[PDB]
Design a protein around this ligand. Structure first.
Ligand code: HEM
Length: 154
């Protein structure tokens, strides 16, 4: 798949807003994922112990990892489809080291869309959400293909 330039512009316009507060958005997205799909929390030996939303919100470590996640995702999105080098090390660590099944990438995709819709309603109308979804689908498709190449499947 290929996004058009107009779709990329909708994606990067809302992303510019996200980047005004990377830590806050990172926290919100990981917490949404762990509340909506509790099984994902189990893959994080670092965070597995957190029992409640209050505890997640107070963890400086979780916030730091949220920044790490969104910074890496932001770098991929800014490539506007030319992301093969950025994707390679991420595919390898998530497939071989962390052992994350590809279905969980769908779950975090959902979490990102939820938080952008909640925080940025005026810059995340239906057309902008559709463009963000296509971007995330492109990312998932390419990561799935690399999983296969690496011997995992997802
Ligand atoms: C937008 C998708 C994602 C991005 C951009 C992302 C990015 C990253 C980055 C940059 C790291 C640190 C370096 C590395 O280990 O590769 C990391 C670590 C990790 N990721 Fe992801 N990740 C994503 C989705 C997920 C999902 C869906 C899960 C699990 C449900 C996951 C599980 C982990 C784990 C367990 C670690 C190691 C944490 C630690 O113990 O420090 N990732 N991720």
């Amino acid at each position: 798949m290929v996004l058009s330039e107009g779709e990329w512009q909708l994606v990067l316009h809302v992303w510019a807003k996200v980047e005004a507060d990377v830590a806050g958005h990172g926290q919100d997205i990981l917490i949404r994922l762990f509340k909506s799909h509790p099984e994902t929390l189990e893959k994080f030996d670092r965070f597995k112990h957190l029992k409640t939303e209050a505890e997640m919100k107070a963890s400086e470590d979780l916030k730091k990892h949220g920044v790490t996640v969104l910074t890496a995702l932001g770098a991929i999105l800014k490539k506007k489809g030319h992301h093969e080098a950025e994707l390679k090390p991420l595919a390898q660590s998530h497939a071989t080291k962390h052992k994350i099944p590809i279905k969980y990438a769908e779950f975090i995709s959902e979490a990102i869309i939820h938080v952008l819709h909640s925080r940025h309603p005026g810059n995340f109308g239906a057309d902008a959400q559709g463009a963000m979804n296509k971007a995330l689908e492109l990312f998932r498709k390419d990561i799935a293909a690399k999983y296969k190449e690496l011997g995992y499947q997802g």
